Every structure is written in C-alpha cells, then in structure tokens.
Amino acid sequence: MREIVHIQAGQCGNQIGAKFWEVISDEHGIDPTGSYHGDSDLQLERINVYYNEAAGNKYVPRAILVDLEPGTMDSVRSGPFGQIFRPDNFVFGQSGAGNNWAKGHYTEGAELVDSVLDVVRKESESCDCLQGFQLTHSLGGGTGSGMGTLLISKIREEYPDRIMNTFSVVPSPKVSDTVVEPYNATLSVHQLVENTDETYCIDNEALYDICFRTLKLTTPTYGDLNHLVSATMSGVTTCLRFPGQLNADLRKLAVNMVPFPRLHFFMPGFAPLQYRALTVPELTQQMFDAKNMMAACDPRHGRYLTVAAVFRGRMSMKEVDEQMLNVQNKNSSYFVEWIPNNVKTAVCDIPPRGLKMSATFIGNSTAIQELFKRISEQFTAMFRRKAFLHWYTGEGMDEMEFTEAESNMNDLVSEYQQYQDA
C-alpha cells in the first residue's frame, strides 16, 4: 500500500507542511472535514500514499506535527484545513527552543523526542507497507533544525532501511530572524549528510528573489514564500500521488537520483512562475533557468549528476521528449558525460489548481556547493571570534563539536568539487 509518513517540525516546517497538505488535499478532492468530493477515481486511486482511511469514510493525512512551543500548532488548528489533521498527531512542548540548535537537539528537544517517536510508531504500525518518511523543517531555527535532526537520527536508528526525505529550508541573511542561523544550519547539514536519502534545498534567498524580481511583490511575506514551496512539493510528489505509467517507491526514486551517498542535496525548480497558455518550449526553457531554481545557486557554475523533470497537464509527450532532448543536446557540457541518460522525465495528466500546464524540476547538481560555501563563510566569520557561542556552550556543547561540523561541511564541498571537475 506504499504508505508515506509525513513529519513537520517547528514554525517553518509546520507552516510549509500545512500549505503542502492544503494543496495536495485540494488535488485529491479532500475537503477540510476529510470527505472526498471529487469527480474522478484517479484522485482516490493512490490516495493511501499520504492519507489514512477512517471509519466515517474520512481520509486523514498521515502527518505528525511537532514543535517545542504551542503557538504555531494553535495556528495550524485554526488554519483552513486544520480540522483534517489527527488530534493525537499534535505533539508539542511548552518551553520553545529560542532559535537554538542545542536546545532543539540536546536539552529541550530530547525531553519530547520519545513522545514524537511513539506517534510515528503508531502510524507506521498500521501501514500496509511503509515506504518511508518526509520531514518539513527549516535549518536556521532551533526546533525544526535541532529537534528535526534528532528525530531523523532516531528514525534512522529504528527504521534503518527506510527512505528518509526532507524538504529543508536553508537560511539566508536576506531573510533572517537571528544572527545564529549559520550555526544552526551548519550543525544540521552534517546530520542530513549522514541520515537522509534525499534533501530538497529550499533557500529563502531564492524564494525572496523570485517573489521580488519575477513575481513583482514589493514586500513578500512568509505566506508568499510558502506558496512557492507548497507548489514545488506538490510537483515533486505528483509522480507517486497520481495514476500513470511509473511503478516507483521512494527507494527506486532515490536509487535513480543519488549516485553517491553523501551527495543527495537537490535543487528544486518550478515553472511557470497571468493567462497566456505556456507552450512546451516555454515550460522547458523556464524550468532550467537559474531564475526558477529554489536553492539560489547558478547551475552554470557546476554540473548535473542527475535530473528529474515532472510535467503536469494535457500535452504532447512527443513534444516534451523533443524539448527535453533539445535542452540536453544544446547544453551537453553541464551534464556529466560519465552517467549516461541521466535526465529522466515524468508526465502526469492531472494539472495543479489554476495552471493548465506546469513543470517541476529536481536537479542533483554539483553547483549546490555554492549554498554550502555561503553558509560555511558565515559560520567561519563568527566562529573564528567565537561570537554567540555562549548560547550553545551554556547548553553543554563544546567548541570541538562546532569545529567538527565546520570540517564536515568543508569536506562535503570538496566532494562536490571533485565530481564537478571529473
């Protein structure tokens, strides 16, 4: 039955999670009460991937909601689809984590992690055949970052052969809540390097530049960024949520996308970003455009290890193949020659709400090193003077752990560079 368990941790994680659930619930014809009111059996044909079936012939998201503070989960429960979530799947503490990875991972978070794992186990136990997990969170705060990576580590320990996938919002000084975000992000990337199979790098810098430059929004809110995130996530889960030609599970996708275990950080993109119907050439050109990428990295500065393209809507598969081939053949130097046929294409007949045609892009590119270099420089700029370290050592962390995290991330960068020059 190929069940996925979804986990959203912290403020960012839970807001983007909520948008994800409202968007896909709309695609599957599920209303806020959990009743199906769609027009097509394809909407229900693979519904069990993300939704449990309840007695009242209710479909309930297979979703666990975690935070160290209550605020955001009250806001979820009051949100438009808030009644659809299982009440027992809300697991919240009272203390908060103060944007402090050490509080999320070692002190405040550890007290709550067991109760979160109990709910994960209760959901998995009733799965016909759990394929694995997806987590939504930011890396810049304390709960999603520190407690999220703690959760990931515990899930790996108890489900070591299951796929662990994250949608991870990466911090940027252009959209910043605290100065300590690079510390929290550096500590978290190391964890993801060890304990996830796939991590979608969603950079608030890129989301901001898209809202501002392309969408012409002078003052973009978190709501505007999360609209892009939810549309991207809908796109990336399309190929498993709707009927079609592909017999896939998270492991087959991972095996096709991840050539080396540590290099599993993907750039997502979306097109189109208006009433003019978009031709296949236009979707194809825009989905590969730097300006559509959500991890503010120039793909012309690296090479593609692998690419997945997912097209949604009624269109010519012939025309799709021709345009995808055109972009690969005309830009062959940006695709590594030593992985043949490394661009894969999926088509789903069902378009998202409002757009007639859309494309979602997943790239495993060596250019993602630019993101980690960015974070590393901000980390070093502080860590060379030990600035703000007392917030962390006061929760029991040693300087040594920071030095090791910094080293792990410079090694990740060096590995990406090795494969970019090969």
């Binding site: 070692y106 002190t107 550890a110 006061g394 929760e395 029991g396 040693d398």
Partner: protein
Amino acid sequence: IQKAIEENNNFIKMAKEKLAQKMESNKENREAHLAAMLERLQEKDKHAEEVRKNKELKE
C-alpha cells in the same frame, strides 16, 4: 545534557559559596570596627576614673 546540568549546578554552587564567604567576612569586619570603637571608649572611661582618683588623692 549532563555537562549542561553540571555547569548550571557549578554556577549555583560557586555563587552560593562566594556570597556566604563575603557575608561572613563583612560581619567579622563590621563587628571588629565596633569593638575597636567601644574599646577606645572604655579606655576613656578608665582614664576618667584615674582622673577622679588623682583628684581624690590630691586632697
């Protein structure tokens, strides 16, 4: 988590011992100042008695 607990306890411990040492040292110093002042006044009362005796034994 154990290192964090230990550091909090050591801060409480060291502040408790520092405060108690300061308050004791202050009590001893204040009492010594008053005892020295009183001792000077008692030396005055002794001298006043020797004066009243000198005056008696002059007669």
